[PDB]
Design an enzyme around this catalytic site. Structure first.
Site, PDB file in Angstrom:
ATOM      1  N   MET A 138       0.672  -0.952  -0.401  1.00 51.52           N
ATOM      2  CA  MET A 138      -0.135   0.086  -0.417  1.00 51.52           C
ATOM      3  C   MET A 138       0.687   1.291  -0.235  1.00 51.52           C
ATOM      4  O   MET A 138       1.452   1.477   1.083  1.00 51.52           O
ATOM      5  CB  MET A 138      -0.971   0.395   1.229  1.00 51.52           C
ATOM      6  CG  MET A 138      -2.241  -1.762   1.402  1.00 51.52           C
ATOM      7  SD  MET A 138      -3.517  -1.364   2.809  1.00 51.52           S
ATOM      8  CE  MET A 138      -2.825  -1.679   4.164  1.00 51.52           C
ATOM      9  N   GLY A 139       0.949   2.048  -1.002  1.00 51.76           N
ATOM     10  CA  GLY A 139       2.111   3.312  -1.443  1.00 51.76           C
ATOM     11  C   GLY A 139       3.025   3.464  -0.672  1.00 51.76           C
ATOM     12  O   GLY A 139       3.834   1.462  -1.217  1.00 51.76           O
ATOM     13  N   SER A 140       3.700   3.836  -0.377  1.00 52.07           N
ATOM     14  CA  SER A 140       5.053   4.014   0.686  1.00 52.07           C
ATOM     15  C   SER A 140       5.117   4.502   1.361  1.00 52.07           C
ATOM     16  O   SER A 140       4.465   3.790   2.552  1.00 52.07           O
ATOM     17  CB  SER A 140       5.687   5.503  -0.314  1.00 52.07           C
ATOM     18  OG  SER A 140       6.854   5.374  -0.781  1.00 52.07           O
ATOM     19  N   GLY A 141       6.717   2.909   1.599  1.00 47.71           N
ATOM     20  CA  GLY A 141       6.955   2.848   2.695  1.00 47.71           C
ATOM     21  C   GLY A 141       7.534   4.944   3.690  1.00 47.71           C
ATOM     22  O   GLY A 141       8.773   5.157   3.793  1.00 47.71           O
ATOM     23  N   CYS A 171       6.370   4.814   7.027  1.00 46.46           N
ATOM     24  CA  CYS A 171       7.752   5.048   8.010  1.00 46.46           C
ATOM     25  C   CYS A 171       7.894   3.468   8.065  1.00 46.46           C
ATOM     26  O   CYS A 171       8.931   3.232   8.476  1.00 46.46           O
ATOM     27  CB  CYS A 171       6.201   5.364   9.361  1.00 46.46           C
ATOM     28  SG  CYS A 171       6.571   5.222  10.771  1.00 46.46           S
ATOM     29  N   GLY A 172       7.161   3.100   7.759  1.00 40.75           N
ATOM     30  CA  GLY A 172       7.552   1.349   6.746  1.00 40.75           C
ATOM     31  C   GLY A 172       7.213   1.061   6.297  1.00 40.75           C
ATOM     32  O   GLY A 172       5.591   1.924   5.580  1.00 40.75           O
ATOM     33  N   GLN A 173       7.111  -0.222   5.490  1.00 44.12           N
ATOM     34  CA  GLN A 173       7.087  -0.995   4.177  1.00 44.12           C
ATOM     35  C   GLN A 173       5.281  -0.980   4.720  1.00 44.12           C
ATOM     36  O   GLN A 173       5.410  -2.202   5.699  1.00 44.12           O
ATOM     37  CB  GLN A 173       7.708  -2.050   3.387  1.00 44.12           C
ATOM     38  CG  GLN A 173       7.041  -2.843   2.249  1.00 44.12           C
ATOM     39  CD  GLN A 173       8.138  -3.783   1.840  1.00 44.12           C
ATOM     40  OE1 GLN A 173       9.371  -4.711   2.073  1.00 44.12           O
ATOM     41  NE2 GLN A 173       8.735  -3.128   0.514  1.00 44.12           N
ATOM     42  N   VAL A 174       4.622  -1.138   4.708  1.00 45.59           N
ATOM     43  CA  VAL A 174       2.748  -1.836   4.841  1.00 45.59           C
ATOM     44  C   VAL A 174       2.156  -2.509   3.515  1.00 45.59           C
ATOM     45  O   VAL A 174       2.096  -2.028   2.340  1.00 45.59           O
ATOM     46  CB  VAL A 174       1.975  -0.220   4.939  1.00 45.59           C
ATOM     47  CG1 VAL A 174       0.526  -0.706   5.973  1.00 45.59           C
ATOM     48  CG2 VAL A 174       2.806   0.589   5.559  1.00 45.59           C
ATOM     49  N   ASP A 201       3.601  16.649  13.156  1.00 38.47           N
ATOM     50  CA  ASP A 201       3.656  16.468  11.908  1.00 38.47           C
ATOM     51  C   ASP A 201       1.827  16.095  11.333  1.00 38.47           C
ATOM     52  O   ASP A 201       1.804  14.883  11.022  1.00 38.47           O
ATOM     53  CB  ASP A 201       4.471  15.105  11.444  1.00 38.47           C
ATOM     54  CG  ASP A 201       5.007  15.340   9.833  1.00 38.47           C
ATOM     55  OD1 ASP A 201       5.663  14.057   9.501  1.00 38.47           O
ATOM     56  OD2 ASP A 201       4.406  16.293   9.698  1.00 38.47           O
TER      57      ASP A 201
HETATM   58  C1  LIG Z   1      -1.079   8.941   1.698  1.00 40.34           C
HETATM   59  C2  LIG Z   1      -1.511   7.526   2.458  1.00 40.34           C
HETATM   60  C3  LIG Z   1      -0.647   7.246   1.859  1.00 40.34           C
HETATM   61  O1  LIG Z   1      -0.785   7.085   0.979  1.00 40.34           O
HETATM   62  N1  LIG Z   1      -0.014   6.650   3.366  1.00 40.34           N
HETATM   63  C4  LIG Z   1       1.667   5.558   2.986  1.00 40.34           C
HETATM   64  C5  LIG Z   1       1.160   4.412   2.841  1.00 40.34           C
HETATM   65  C6  LIG Z   1       0.846   3.447   3.794  1.00 40.34           C
HETATM   66  C7  LIG Z   1      -0.673   3.990   3.876  1.00 40.34           C
HETATM   67  N2  LIG Z   1      -1.494   3.726   5.269  1.00 40.34           N
HETATM   68  N3  LIG Z   1      -0.445   3.642   6.563  1.00 40.34           N
HETATM   69  C8  LIG Z   1      -0.868   3.334   7.381  1.00 40.34           C
HETATM   70  C9  LIG Z   1      -1.947   2.647   6.933  1.00 40.34           C
HETATM   71  C10 LIG Z   1      -3.408   2.067   7.250  1.00 40.34           C
HETATM   72  N4  LIG Z   1      -2.806   1.358   8.703  1.00 40.34           N
HETATM   73  N5  LIG Z   1      -4.874   1.979   6.869  1.00 40.34           N
HETATM   74  C11 LIG Z   1      -4.158   2.136   5.407  1.00 40.34           C
HETATM   75  N6  LIG Z   1      -3.081   2.470   4.813  1.00 40.34           N
HETATM   76  C12 LIG Z   1      -1.904   2.555   5.500  1.00 40.34           C
HETATM   77  C13 LIG Z   1      -0.493   5.412   4.269  1.00 40.34           C
END
Ligand SMILES: *CCC(=O)N1CCC[C@@H](n2ncc3c(N)ncnc32)C1
Length: 275
Positions: free
Chosen positions: A25-28, A30-33, A142
């Site tokens: 999902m998206g970019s890392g 904070c971490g690789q998700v 932030d």
């Molecule tokens: C702008 C939202 C986005 O692109 N990001 C960065 C990638 C990870 C994404 N994300 N971080 C934690 C998440 C949870 N718990 N659910 C869904 N997406 C999540 C946020």
């Protein structure tokens, strides 16, 4: 505690190979998700993966964020962690799956986000920062649209605390600075336009913040007087005159959307339908 996964009361003894990887999902940031599916249930969840061989700095940030979110198991406006898996090579942090962030909804919508939604969003985010300053003494440092997550069932939570302990405010460059960042985010989502979009460098943004008057919500978009007043309050250059959350939570704009029912669940699913 490691090894246990609990989705709403029901607790399950599980390990990493009990989950199917459905893609990143998206970019890392904070971490690789990853998006992952629980083979026993069918539940799909967000799993952040920290590798012990990874970047030392990113790993310090992932542990801080986890520290905050396990502390916040009783804030409905902070994303809940469902458990952790610790193997010899990685740490897997199971989070409730959200939809996307306000930044990407702004992308999809290709224009302003309605005051109704920004209303429910201001309530959930202010209370999040308040809960975090009161019961734990943390401040976020932030707050921006990519950190505001939404889901199809209407929930609006705050998500990234990796640099958070105890969009930049005037006194954080030149000594309640999370109050300033929330207002800049609100003006961006309200107009669809970032109020410092013509700056070609970071320091040029900082000079605009201190030199020119705060970005104000425009007067020709039908915004209610309470919304305009709330943003003017957060966007106070002098931090001595900026209100604390106990005063912010009594603002009429906050009070309108604590009670009013706003179908954000439907609005979210239609935006996501449009490409
Ligand atoms: C702008 C939202 C986005 O692109 N990001 C960065 C990638 C990870 C994404 N994300 N971080 C934690 C998440 C949870 N718990 N659910 C869904 N997406 C999540 C946020």
């Amino acid at each position: 505690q490691t090894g246990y996964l609990t989705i709403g009361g029901q607790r399950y003894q599980a390990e990493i190979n009990d989950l199917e990887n459905l893609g990143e999902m998206g970019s890392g940031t904070c971490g690789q998700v990853w998006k992952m599916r629980f083979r026993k249930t069918g539940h799909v969840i967000a799993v952040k993966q920290m590798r012990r061989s990874g970047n030392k700095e990113e790993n310090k940030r992932i542990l801080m964020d986890l520290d905050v979110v396990l502390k916040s198991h009783d804030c409905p406006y902070i994303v809940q962690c469902f458990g952790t898996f610790i193997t010899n090579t990685d740490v897997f942090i199971a989070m409730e799956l959200m939809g996307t962030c306000a930044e990407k909804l702004k992308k999809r919508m290709q224009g302003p986000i309605p005051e109704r939604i920004l209303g429910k969003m201001t309530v959930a985010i202010v209370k999040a920062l308040y809960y975090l300053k009161e019961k734990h003494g943390v401040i976020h440092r932030d707050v921006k649209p990519s950190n505001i997550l939404l889901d199809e069932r209407g929930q609006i939570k705050l998500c990234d605390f990796g640099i958070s302990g105890r969009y930049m405010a005037p006194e954080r460059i030149d000594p309640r600075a999370d109050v300033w960042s929330l207002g800049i985010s609100l003006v961006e989502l309200a107009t669809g336009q970032f109020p410092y979009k013509n700056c070609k460098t970071d320091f040029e943004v900082l000079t605009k913040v201190l030199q020119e008057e705060p970005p104000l919500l425009p007067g020709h978009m039908g915004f209610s007087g309470d919304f305009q007043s709330f943003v003017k309050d957060c966007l106070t250059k002098d931090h001595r005159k900026r209100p604390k959350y106990n005063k912010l939570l009594e603002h009429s704009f906050i009070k309108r959307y604590e009670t009013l029912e706003v179908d954000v669940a439907s609005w979210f699913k239609d935006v996501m339908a449009k490409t």
